[PDB]
Amino acid sequence: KQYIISEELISEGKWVKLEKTTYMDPTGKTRTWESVKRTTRKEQTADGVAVIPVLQRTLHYECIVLVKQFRPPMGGYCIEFPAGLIDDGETPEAAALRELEEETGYKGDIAECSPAVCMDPGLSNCTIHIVTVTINGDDAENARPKPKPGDGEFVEVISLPKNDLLQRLDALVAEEHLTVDARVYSYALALKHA
Amino acid sequence: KQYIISEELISEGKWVKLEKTTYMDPTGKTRTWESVKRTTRKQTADGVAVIPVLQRTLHYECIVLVKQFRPPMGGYCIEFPAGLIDDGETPEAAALRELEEETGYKGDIAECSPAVCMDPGLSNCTIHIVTVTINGDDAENARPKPKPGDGEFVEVISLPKNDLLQRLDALVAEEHLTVDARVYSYALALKHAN
Ligand SMILES: COC(=O)CNC(=O)c1cc(C)on1
Ligand SMILES: [Cl-]
Ligand SMILES: [Mg+2]
Ligand SMILES: [Mg+2]
Ligand SMILES: [Mg+2]
Ligand SMILES: [Mg+2]
């Protein structure tokens, strides 16, 4: 039934743009929408990756590695899966492992890689692959792991037990002013619901 | 350490604006960020997303999802029922309202998240994730009556909670839909809890 008729640019920045989107609704009537898109997407299967990093060590409970950063759009600190945009020509797996190492210092091993999934499809066209990665915390490579943040990147690492993730998140939100990411919360919820 | 210095409007639509955010990086250097906000927020958050757990005796527990044409995505997406919280509406009540409009189901609140961010590197958009149980054996949920508001066109897809990630992958493989990130994160955690 439904499909895009036209996409009129409204305002283009260096990083983001706003479009008036015109589409066919499923009655046969023309309608419009305001859409956001990034300016950076090239041939990549998605804008970005987020990494679900399962830190595994012998005689430790598995931990989920998370990162805390200032997020200008939010006016505040956010707790999120390690994540970044996919470079031109880069595979999602490579981007995941690169971003993981840059933001946390850990070197991971790929476990699985999602199809491109939508970040906020009522608002934007942005997509990521969600890449599950196991981190062998017994390997010396991951012993005293040093984040190699990029220019103007400043990230703290927070590793939380998978078996208590949601309470550990609720506890952190109760103790400082910060926002947990919706994907992080959803994953912690399902850990509880299973 | 980091904080917002100022916000310059770049472009304001009916529904969404684009701002240039000037912020202080932790080294003492001033830096800029392109940020998207909705124009609709008062509110604890912009919206709600409902995790609807359909419980029928002698049946697998299902998670109820909606498929909708998403203009920014230029395609159909599979998502948790969701909408914006009406000014003067609680997140809980928004959840039940939305769940009923989108799916026809009448649920009960199990729990409700703090405001969580949707894509904090791009937008300030936030939601409450609201876990609802649906008594599928109740007479009110026998033939669930979905109420599409103006310009909403919503298919309901219920999937077994214990195979959710495999079932979502099937739909993407077979049907060229995009799965929402929050839905995929929850589906992953269901598999990862084992
Ligand atoms: C040299 O300038 C920068 O790298 C600042 N980055 C952004 O403004 C930005 C906005 C969005 C979306 O993603 N990155
Ligand atoms: Cl439940
Ligand atoms: Mg990042
Ligand atoms: Mg990075
Ligand atoms: Mg909706
Ligand atoms: Mg609705």
Block residue for tokens 């990521």? A128
Q: How many CA atoms lie within 13 A of B24 on its CB side?
A: 8
In units of Å, what resolution does this entry have? 2.0
Q: Rounded to whole angstroms, what are the CA distances from A27 to A2, A31, A81, A93, B150?
A: 9, 11, 40, 41, 12
Distance CA A116, CA A91 (A): 12
Atom of ligand 1 nearest to the CA of B36: 12
Block residue for tokens 């077979």? B174
For residue B101, the ligand closest to its alpha carbon is 6
Query: How many angstroms does the Cα of residue A82 sit away from the middle of ligand 6?
Result: 31
Distance CA B13, CA B18 (A): 9
Q: Which two tokens stand for residue A140?
A: 């010396």
Distance CA B153, CA B146 (A): 10
Where do the domains of chain B lie? 1-194
Best of B16, B25, B34 for a ligand 1 pocket test (most atoms within 8 Å of beta carbon): B34
Q: Which fold does the domain A1-194 belong to in CATH?
A: Nucleoside Triphosphate Pyrophosphohydrolase (3.90.79)
Q: How was this structure determined?
A: X-ray
DSSP bridge partners of A107 = none
Nearest CA in chain A to B177: A117
Distance CA A129, CA A168 (A): 25
Q: How many CA atoms lie within 13 A of B149 on its CB side?
A: 9
**Is residue A174 classed exposed, middle or buried when 0-12, 13-18 and 19+ CB atoms within 10 A define those classes?**
exposed
Return the closest-CA partner of residue B68 out of A186, A130, A23: A23
Any ligand 1 atom below 6 A from CB of A73: no
Query: How many angstroms does the Cα of residue A114 sit away from the middle of ligand 5?
Result: 24
A56 contacts A102 by C-beta, under 8 angstroms: no
